[PDB]
Design an enzyme around this catalytic site. Structure first.
Site, PDB file in Angstrom:
ATOM      1  CG  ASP A 200      44.179  37.115  29.529  1.00 30.18           C
ATOM      2  OD1 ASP A 200      44.885  36.374  28.817  1.00 30.18           O
ATOM      3  OD2 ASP A 200      43.028  37.474  29.205  1.00 30.18           O
ATOM      4  CG  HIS A 356      44.182  44.885  30.020  1.00 31.72           C
ATOM      5  ND1 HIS A 356      45.361  44.642  30.690  1.00 31.72           N
ATOM      6  CD2 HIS A 356      43.342  43.881  30.365  1.00 31.72           C
ATOM      7  CE1 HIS A 356      45.237  43.545  31.414  1.00 31.72           C
ATOM      8  NE2 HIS A 356      44.022  43.063  31.234  1.00 31.72           N
ATOM      9  CG  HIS A 390      44.398  42.375  36.582  1.00 33.03           C
ATOM     10  ND1 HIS A 390      44.350  41.697  35.384  1.00 33.03           N
ATOM     11  CD2 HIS A 390      43.173  42.237  37.141  1.00 33.03           C
ATOM     12  CE1 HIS A 390      43.150  41.168  35.227  1.00 33.03           C
ATOM     13  NE2 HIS A 390      42.417  41.481  36.280  1.00 33.03           N
ATOM     14  CD  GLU A 415      47.008  37.812  37.086  1.00 32.28           C
ATOM     15  OE1 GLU A 415      46.477  38.930  36.944  1.00 32.28           O
ATOM     16  OE2 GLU A 415      46.392  36.744  36.922  1.00 32.28           O
ATOM     17  CG  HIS A 417      46.296  32.992  36.690  1.00 36.81           C
ATOM     18  ND1 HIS A 417      45.416  33.416  35.721  1.00 36.81           N
ATOM     19  CD2 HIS A 417      45.664  32.003  37.364  1.00 36.81           C
ATOM     20  CE1 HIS A 417      44.301  32.714  35.803  1.00 36.81           C
ATOM     21  NE2 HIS A 417      44.428  31.849  36.791  1.00 36.81           N
ATOM     22  CD  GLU A 460      43.436  35.608  37.806  1.00 36.30           C
ATOM     23  OE1 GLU A 460      44.416  35.221  37.136  1.00 36.30           O
ATOM     24  OE2 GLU A 460      42.311  35.830  37.311  1.00 36.30           O
ATOM     25  CD  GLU A 536      38.778  39.992  36.134  1.00 32.96           C
ATOM     26  OE1 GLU A 536      39.381  39.068  35.545  1.00 32.96           O
ATOM     27  OE2 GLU A 536      39.253  40.640  37.087  1.00 32.96           O
ATOM     28  CE1 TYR A 537      29.969  43.250  35.918  1.00 34.59           C
ATOM     29  CE2 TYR A 537      28.140  41.969  35.064  1.00 34.59           C
ATOM     30  CZ  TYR A 537      28.715  43.188  35.350  1.00 34.59           C
ATOM     31  OH  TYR A 537      28.034  44.351  35.069  1.00 34.59           O
ATOM     32  CG  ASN A 596      49.366  30.900  20.607  1.00 35.03           C
ATOM     33  OD1 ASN A 596      50.122  30.191  19.942  1.00 35.03           O
ATOM     34  ND2 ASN A 596      48.069  31.010  20.343  1.00 35.03           N
ATOM     35  CG  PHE A 600      40.860  32.618  25.278  1.00 34.92           C
ATOM     36  CD1 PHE A 600      39.725  32.653  26.069  1.00 34.92           C
ATOM     37  CD2 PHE A 600      41.156  31.455  24.588  1.00 34.92           C
ATOM     38  CE1 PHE A 600      38.897  31.552  26.167  1.00 34.92           C
ATOM     39  CE2 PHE A 600      40.333  30.349  24.684  1.00 34.92           C
ATOM     40  CZ  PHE A 600      39.202  30.399  25.476  1.00 34.92           C
ATOM     41  CG  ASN A 603      38.692  38.483  26.480  1.00 34.95           C
ATOM     42  OD1 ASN A 603      39.729  38.583  27.137  1.00 34.95           O
ATOM     43  ND2 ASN A 603      38.460  37.466  25.659  1.00 34.95           N
TER      44      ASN A 603
HETATM   45  O1  PTQ Z   1      40.064  34.908  28.741  1.00 31.14           O
HETATM   46  C1  PTQ Z   1      40.999  35.144  29.769  1.00 31.14           C
HETATM   47  C2  PTQ Z   1      40.335  34.913  31.108  1.00 31.14           C
HETATM   48  O2  PTQ Z   1      40.925  33.808  31.748  1.00 31.14           O
HETATM   49  C3  PTQ Z   1      40.292  33.468  32.957  1.00 31.14           C
HETATM   50  S1  PTQ Z   1      40.999  31.992  33.638  1.00 31.14           S
HETATM   51  C4  PTQ Z   1      40.990  30.711  32.413  1.00 31.14           C
HETATM   52  C5  PTQ Z   1      40.262  31.197  31.180  1.00 31.14           C
HETATM   53  C6  PTQ Z   1      41.129  30.919  29.973  1.00 31.14           C
HETATM   54  C7  PTQ Z   1      42.284  30.238  30.108  1.00 31.14           C
HETATM   55  C8  PTQ Z   1      43.144  29.958  28.897  1.00 31.14           C
HETATM   56  C9  PTQ Z   1      42.757  30.395  27.683  1.00 31.14           C
HETATM   57  C10 PTQ Z   1      41.463  31.161  27.528  1.00 31.14           C
HETATM   58  C11 PTQ Z   1      40.694  31.408  28.609  1.00 31.14           C
HETATM   59  C12 PTQ Z   1      40.469  34.598  33.943  1.00 31.14           C
HETATM   60  O3  PTQ Z   1      39.751  34.283  35.109  1.00 31.14           O
HETATM   61  C13 PTQ Z   1      39.935  35.887  33.356  1.00 31.14           C
HETATM   62  O4  PTQ Z   1      40.275  36.958  34.204  1.00 31.14           O
HETATM   63  C14 PTQ Z   1      40.502  36.143  31.974  1.00 31.14           C
HETATM   64  O5  PTQ Z   1      41.866  36.467  32.079  1.00 31.14           O
HETATM   65 MG    MG Z   2      44.768  35.955  35.068  1.00 36.50          MG
HETATM   66 NA    NA Z   3      41.043  36.983  28.302  1.00 32.75          NA
END
Ligand code: PTQ
Ligand code: MG
Ligand code: NA
Ligand code: PTQ
Ligand code: MG
Ligand code: MG
Ligand code: MG
Ligand code: NA
Ligand code: NA
Ligand code: NA
EC number: 3.2.1.23
Lengths: 1022, 205, 205
Positions: A200, A356, A390, A415, A417, A460, A536-537, A596, A600, A603
């Site tokens: 991400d 990051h 990561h 990764e 995902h 992931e 992560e939390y 896009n 997000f 963070n």
């Molecule tokens: O904000 C990013 C986060 O996305 C979530 S998944 C789905 C969350 C998500 C998906 C698409 C757009 C925004 C958030 C991951 O688990 C986190 O590590 C982090 O990368």
């Molecule tokens: Mg991810």
């Molecule tokens: Na994010």
């Protein structure tokens, strides 16, 4: 040479074949400096055999790798440009950068990549020293190239490599020649390796890390390992050092390993090459083992670094040294025992954060100054750990963590995902060779660093057979560090620790296949022994860390809960420039990239410049290494330090009523590790003046430190004691307010001041002083706030998400609820004038809220507003229950008595301290890149803005921007300061959250679900 | 079913198998075998290879098979046949009573091996009783021990058939050739013939 | 086609690089017969979609892979001979076979192999059915080639593979054409994979 030509090289596509991940690339190893002097190695003097190729290179961008002209090999193009290396060419404007979270930037068709993949051509001219060519070996070290490239030296093809986050090394001894040399690098943005790289973050390509030339001797130290064994008393340590050489093997040459502590050598070891018999064939002839006895050594930790310097040199028996290598040694032990992660026999509570490698101006290029800057801020905010997420970080980052003292979890560059399912590639045997090289080469490079305590398989990638095999491999080569992996439910066989993502404290997300349990429940599951550390939390996206205190209450209570890593540390926002030239923070789809994942990307706990967010003081307070338990007059200080004694701590306590200091004292903090100290305070004065006494203690560091200045505050705590209620009678002044009733509205006059109440709306339309004016917009009830990133969630305009708070509020019609004046009356009491009103908010025929108010105008001019609000049960609970208005006056300063000085919410106010605070109006506004509700101060008893004054307990967020303007605005730079000042005084406010951004994470008790609410504030002038 | 990995000529024997750069090659020799022969009922045991010493690649490859196919136990002889890369203890030509004392990799008695501190795994000799020429002397000792000791579940005899090649005299008559009969040097002479039967194939006594 | 030419293919040495163990080789699987009838599958009736290429091939032996003439791609050499496939060319007298137990038949210098490694050139002529070409996929299955080889179909390079004891499969859908087709296989006796293959047996390629 036909074979060296592009057409021949490009035909055999290496960037699409999973089997081919590297060609003619040297073996992985820790960073070799190749010193030719033992003293140079010992004091870490810059090596002469090591040359940095960093500087101005000639660059050319291309739509496709095949589009590159053939003439590029012998000479550079005239159309080429000069950009700095290392750098991302996306930030040079050559090719837009793109931000995606889960979805791949390219079409998911493994292992194939788009035909049109942006190609960056790098060419360099330099003069190789003559002495390098005559004897020894030269190798070029691409510390990081993103994501695949072919190398050409003097027109001839050297090799090929992948994996951007690890050094690619190629022997250039045969290709180099006397005089001018040219290095042609064809860097490809997209490679089959991109499928293993779906983190991400912003997607950028090019040579983003250092490029260097290393000269080694004919007989070289090809590799060396350093391990540390300890007695159970931890008072006796042995340093077993395995040394490999690339020979050119002979009997006479030796290897000497010596440990240095500063300028003093504590131990040394000299032995001929040859290993112990390990099989029927025998042992390694080219290897040697040197174990050095160290008595009563200093143990490495985040609290106390205590680094050792080890010099490994290969020398002839006479003796002259052929090559000298050096390494920083930290003596510590990291082992899980009885289901607990232990460091040096002590359970370590992880107060870490995910980080990051990002720069707002330089993309993903990392300078030394930014690495130091981040580390200092982390330690200064009670962070002892960092999770490079990561991917394998800069080799210098580990060095800095060694000396400063930070726990490091080194994560492999894997990764997937975007795949469906997430383990499609990781459960594929054909993709195993690619994944292993992303893991094995990382371990070989970073196994010497003390700061690294935990290996990570990736992020992931689901759970596949490749993970279990790769997990077993690390345990085989390096039993010193535990291996963790999150995929597959964080309870798979490929992890030594349970590391769930954003799992919650009490409520558990019920998901098929991969269920997320409560961090307390997860431990208690049948057959669970492993400890739980959240990789992560607490998603710190925008205004977050609500209920963050819940995690750390659970961390300290539950032994197997050894903390976790916060996401994230720094907002990954890029800097763009307006037409006027002024810079502004860009996120997600600001670079014309689609599809896009918008804002997000940001963070982080801090901005990118990097300015701390208001959430960062919350993390600092919850991660402080001193706890406090007040028992009357005596204070109790418990040290959460595992290894260090409180040698440089100073406890200062203040006692104040109404923000006025009545007593203060300094106490030398002399606490033992994991020990508790009882501290008696002198008998405190009893103020006859009514109010609330407050006991505030703080831990100050008198002496300066490598990571902090003198007078630094590490821990603080505030208590509430000896409240004195006021039985004083405000009533009554000699004068009496006068009202005039008309069909149009209501008018109340008292001396210089005049209050007007609109009868059509029911809200007061205007206030007056002098010979003076007051309001710019009538005072009305407010039931909404500007949607936070948590409120928005993953909901977009294209994708409506029912669960999101912002969408529940839109469907309920809170934002579009119109006020209906059902009752409005005005009367005069003997002492004061009282006006009673009652409003109702209705959406599509349904009443949402009923607000009843009884304004009372004292003879002194003080207006007491009593607000009683009823909320329907069917409707989703309101974000706030509040009064709001626009003041025409704009004062430079804001003085208030309450929790501060920084912003705080019901969900996040533990860090805030109650005192009389004074701040400029600009400080009252938090400049989040994505505009929303901000700058709220809770527990405020008194608010002084200009002539105006508001009393009673309330929450306020006075600002120049209205709530309607913020939610409509997409960026912070688009915001224009509205005329006058907007004030939102809310008696009740919903918790902001949250555990994660994508789902509603506001706790039940923090929500406004009572149904009926009441608050009373006294409005006065001066 | 045994994987095609054997690095007996290397010094040490695990030089390649403990090398991360050689891991990709070894995995493809194991993974592709499992994918082909996992349906066959007759196959009951996987094997990582033969004599390849003990490296990190073996432990990883062992863990992979257990992950993809928990139906079959995985055995490997290298590293002393008591390593973490084997589900069964499979010593080569280990003896019944006397135990060969070797450094690093000691060969214990098949009875003693079971009784070692921390031993739970059964013992099946992947190789034993070298049937080279006139052999199988004391072969009754093994099978007396096999029937007596529960954890001793027999083993595999080496070998079944003599690997002898047929050559022809000047007169034309065929004769069995071994080792260095094809003008090859250096060679290991008649050691190629260790079978219980000839190649035609006539049973040995 | 320059890229299909030997000089270009041989330069990028695949038989010496541990990283490259296969090129354009299909995924592993249990033996597919690809029946088009449930009853044929049930009674294990011979499949019509499966064709055995076993039979007489044109063969030529060479001291080194680089020694092979370029004209071999389009047409077979007149000096070529007709030997049966499958077979070992060592038993055909082209190149002596060797027996070693532990010691490598070549100099232990991983991952490099001797410059002079015996090269066997296999070429086959056959007629592909028209129906196969129109729809579906054709793949050639080398059940065992000892120990490394490059495949050419109609002059064009198909792929590369190793590990002698497992089937190497290559998709020939794109390379095949209507009428006569030619399959050129350059089999190399020595490959970096030989280091993983040091079993106590006769060495044949
Ligand atoms: O904000 C990013 C986060 O996305 C979530 S998944 C789905 C969350 C998500 C998906 C698409 C757009 C925004 C958030 C991951 O688990 C986190 O590590 C982090 O990368
Ligand atoms: Mg991810
Ligand atoms: Na994010
Ligand atoms: O007779 C071959 C046997 O050699 C011995 S090692 C050394 C024994 C040896 C070495 C050299 C020549 C003859 C025997 C192996 O352990 C057996 O598996 C088998 O291959
Ligand atoms: Mg590739
Ligand atoms: Mg090869
Ligand atoms: Mg052997
Ligand atoms: Na704990
Ligand atoms: Na038995
Ligand atoms: Na033998």
């Amino acid at each position: 040479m036909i074979t060296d030509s592009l057409a021949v090289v490009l035909q055999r596509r290496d960037w699409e074949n999973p089997g081919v991940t590297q060609l003619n690339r040297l073996a992985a190893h820790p960073p070799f400096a190749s010193w030719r002097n033992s003293e140079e190695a010992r004091t870490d003097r810059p090596s002469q055999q090591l040359r940095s190729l960093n500087g101005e290179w000639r660059f050319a961008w291309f739509p496709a790798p095949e589009a590159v002209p053939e003439s590029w090999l012998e000479c550079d193009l005239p159309e080429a440009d000069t950009v700095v290396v290392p750098s991302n060419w996306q930030m040079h404007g050559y090719d837009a950068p793109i931000y995606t979270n889960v979805t791949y930037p390219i079409t998911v068709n493994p292992p194939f990549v788009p035909t049109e993949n942006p190609t960056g051509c790098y060419s360099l001219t330099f003069n190789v020293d003559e002495s390098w060519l005559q004897e020894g070996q030269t190798r070029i070290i691409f510390d990081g190239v993103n994501s695949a490239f072919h190398l050409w030296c003097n027109g001839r093809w050297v090799g090929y490599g992948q994996d951007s986050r690890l050094p690619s090394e190629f022997d250039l001894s045969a290709f180099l020649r006397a005089g001018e040399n040219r290095l042609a690098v064809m860097v490809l943005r997209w490679s089959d390796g991109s499928y293993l790289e779906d983190q991400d973050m912003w997607r950028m390509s090019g040579i983003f890390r250092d490029v260097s030339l290393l000269h080694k001797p004919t007989t070289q130290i090809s590799d060396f390992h350093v391990a540390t064994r300890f007695n159970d008393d931890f008072s006796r340590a042995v340093l077993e050092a395995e040394v490999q050489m690339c020979g050119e093997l002979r009997d006479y040459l030796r290897v000497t390993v010596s440990l240095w502590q500063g300028e003093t050598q504590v131990a040394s070891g000299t032995a001929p090459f040859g290993g112990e018999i390990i099989d029927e064939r025998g042992g390694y002839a080219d290897r040697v083992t040197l174990r050095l006895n160290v008595e009563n050594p200093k143990l490495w930790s985040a609290e106390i670094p205590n680094l050792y310097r080890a010099v490994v040199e290969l020398h002839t028996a006479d003796g002259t040294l052929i090559e000298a290598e050096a390494c920083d040694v930290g003596f510590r032990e990291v082992r899980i025992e009885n289901g607990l992660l232990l460091l040096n026999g002590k359970p370590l509570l992880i107060r870490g954060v995910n980080r990051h490698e990002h720069h707002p101006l330089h993309g993903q290029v990392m300078d030394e100054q930014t690495m130091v800057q981040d580390i200092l801020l982390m330690k200064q905010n009670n962070f002892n750990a960092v999770r490079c997420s990561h991917y394998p970080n800069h080799p210098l980052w580990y060095t800095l963590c060694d000396r400063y003292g930070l726990y490091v979890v080194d994560e492999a560059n894997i990764e997937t995902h975007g795949m469906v399912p997430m383990n499609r590639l990781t459960d594929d045997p054909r993709w195993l060779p690619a994944m292993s090289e992303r893991v094995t080469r990382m371990v070989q490079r970073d196994r010497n660093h003390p700061s690294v305590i935990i290996w990570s398989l990736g992020n992931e990638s689901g759970h596949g057979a490749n993970h279990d095999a790769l997990y077993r491999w690390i345990k085989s080569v390096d039993p010193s560090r535990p291996v963790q992996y999150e995929g597959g439910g964080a309870d798979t066989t490929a992890t030594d620790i349970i590391c769930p993502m954003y799992a919650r404290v009490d409520e558990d997300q019920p998901f098929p296949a991969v269920p997320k349990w409560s961090i307390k429940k997860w431990l208690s599951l049948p057959g669970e022994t492993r400890p739980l550390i959240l990789c992560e939390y607490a998603h710190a996206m925008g205004n977050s860390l609500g209920g963050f205190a819940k995690y750390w209450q659970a961390f300290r209570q539950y032994p197997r809960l050894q903390g976790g890593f916060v996401w994230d540390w720094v907002d990954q926002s890029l800097i763009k420039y307006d037409e006027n030239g002024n810079p502004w923070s860009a996120y997600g789809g600001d670079f014309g990239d689609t599809p896009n994942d918008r804002q997000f990307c940001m963070n982080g706990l801090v901005f990118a410049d990097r300015t701390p967010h208001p959430a960062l003081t919350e993390a600092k307070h919850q991660q402080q290494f001193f706890q406090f338990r007040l028992s009357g007059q005596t204070i109790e200080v418990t040290s959460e330090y595992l290894f260090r004694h409180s040698d440089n701590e100073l406890l200062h306590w203040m006692v104040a009523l109404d923000g006025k200091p009545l007593a203060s004292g300094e106490v030398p903090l002399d606490v033992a590790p994991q020990g508790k100290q009882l501290i008696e305070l002198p008998e405190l004065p009893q103020p006859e003046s009514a109010g609330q006494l407050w006991l505030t203690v703080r831990v100050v560091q008198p002496n300066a430190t490598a990571w902090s200045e003198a007078g630094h505050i590490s821990a603080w705590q505030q208590w509430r004691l000896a409240e004195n209620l006021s039985v004083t009678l405000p009533a009554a002044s000699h004068a009496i307010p006068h009202l005039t009733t008309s069909e149009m509205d209501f008018c109340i006059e008292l001396g210089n001041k005049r209050w007007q109440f609109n009868r059509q709306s029911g809200f007061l339309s205007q206030m007056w002083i002098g010979d003076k004016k007051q309001l710019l917009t009538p005072l009305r009830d407010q039931f909404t706030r500007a949607p936070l990133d948590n409120d928005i969630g993953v909901s977009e305009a294209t994708r409506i998400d029912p669960n999101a708070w912002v969408e529940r509020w839109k469907a309920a019609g809170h934002y579009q609820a119109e006020a209906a004046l059902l009752q409005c009356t005005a009367d005069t009491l003997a002492d004061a004038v009282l006006i009673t009103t009652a409003h109702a908010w209705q959406h599509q025929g349904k009443t949402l809220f009923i607000s009843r108010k009884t304004y009372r105008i004292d003879g002194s001019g003080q207006m007491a507003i009593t607000v009683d609000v009823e909320v329907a049960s069917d409707t989703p609970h309101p974000a706030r229950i509040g009064l709001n208005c626009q003041l025409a006056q704009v004062a430079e300063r804001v003085n208030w008595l309450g929790l501060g000085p920084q912003e705080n919410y019901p969900d996040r106010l533990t860090a805030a301290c109650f005192d009389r605070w004074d701040l400029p109006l600009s400080d009252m506004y938090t400049p989040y890149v994505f505009p929303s509700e901000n700058g709220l101060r809770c527990g405020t008893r008194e608010l002084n803005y200009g002539p105006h004054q508001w009393r009673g307990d309330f929450q306020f967020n006075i600002s120049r921007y209205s709530q309607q303007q913020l939610m409509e605005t997409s960026h912070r730079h688009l915001l224009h300061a509205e005329e006058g000042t907007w004030l939102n005084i809310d008696g009740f406010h919903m918790g902001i959250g949250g555990d994660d951004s994508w789902s509603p994470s506001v706790s039940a008790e923090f929500q406004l679900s009572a149904g009926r609410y009441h608050y009373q504030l006294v409005w006065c002038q001066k």
